[PDB]
Amino acid sequence: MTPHINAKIGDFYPQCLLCGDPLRVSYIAKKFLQDAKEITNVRNMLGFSGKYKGRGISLMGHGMGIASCTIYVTELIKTYQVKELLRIGTCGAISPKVGLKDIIMATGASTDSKTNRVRFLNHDLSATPDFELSLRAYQTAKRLGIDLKVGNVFSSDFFYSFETHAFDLMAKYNHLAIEMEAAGLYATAMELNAKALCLCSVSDHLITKEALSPKERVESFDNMIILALEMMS
Template sequence: MATPHIAAEKGDFAPAVLMPGDPRRAERIANLLMPDARKVSDVRGIGAYTGTVDGKPLSVMASGMGMPSIGIYANELFGQYDVRRIIRVGTAGGLAHKVKVGDVVVALGAHTDSAMNTSRIPGIHFSAVASYPLVAAAVAAAGDATNVHVAPVVSRDHFYGNPAEQIQALADYGTLAVEMEASALYAIAAQYDREALAVLTISDHLLDHSRDMSAQEREENFERALGLAVAAAHC
């Protein structure tokens, strides 16, 4: 039963879906994790793959960039394909000195400057938070690693032109990273009574751009975050 944006049939997706932003990263993850992966959808160049990891079913699908894009796919996966949990495996910009390029942030919650969640419950400022069992599984998989952080992030509508004083204030309030999808994903998971998590590799830093990853490095350097995401997918 295809949707406007996914050409798969009912049952083609596993209960858990890993969701990077980049279609090339989705294909790379599928090939890395699942020798038995089969492509179940390819609408608009957004490949979706299903296979098994250690005998457990898993799917991988790209989300594209931004909350409207991940919102489309999350709604269709939760609402039409009976997906139970989505784990975003993406990149983020560091906001605070305590995180460095290459570190991983498990996003406990996601502030946002987007209006996407403001109309969900009139009169309420909706809190977009991760699902605790997925957070706990990712943290357990991280063990004693000092380069894995559990903290809020901020999901932005705009990649460019965000006020410097706002960035500093977010860091002062314990926000470690900035990205563009988690807040919408968490809200949609709550709407469907499903689970969601974002596990993010710091690919650049707003306080020091001298060590930013290249486009190729952003595509390839996700192994640590991927291991945590798989642990959350199969907890």
């Protein structure tokens, strides 16, 4: 249908989990969904529709960076009528308020991108999630015993940053971690009147430098997946 998704109209459920890595999307479909069908694979960016506890759920990869995320989110909403979009992924922690295995809920997404200035009159758009989705994540995390850390993330155009000197100031201003898409997901969902939320798993701390083991990374990812799937049930 679109240049970036070759799903049929109606192949997506109204609730979609998102992740930058299509191989992690494939992992979720294989391990946690029943009767998962691969509904799109343009550019090797996979998406699925399947069932979780008898409920329809879609998954979609969106690549790295705001520009990539924006393309997929725009088509999911405008063409495939996706209504709720829940991004899960990893991040680099920068605040002493979080450590390994923590799950962050981004109630705002700051950015060094110019995309929101281009969208929003050259002013400051405060990119935020849908509040109802954030309430649902908080309530589901509590039911599951997850100690959800809530604050801003900083969405960067740079994985190899030229501004590492600024990470301390970012953390002072309640930015818990750096990632690369949340500001784009949030601004696109605001633009198109859809519900979006970003959860981040702390696998690595950019300041204190601790990393999770390959085992621990699978453990903490599964914990975030279950949280996400449970709030969409």
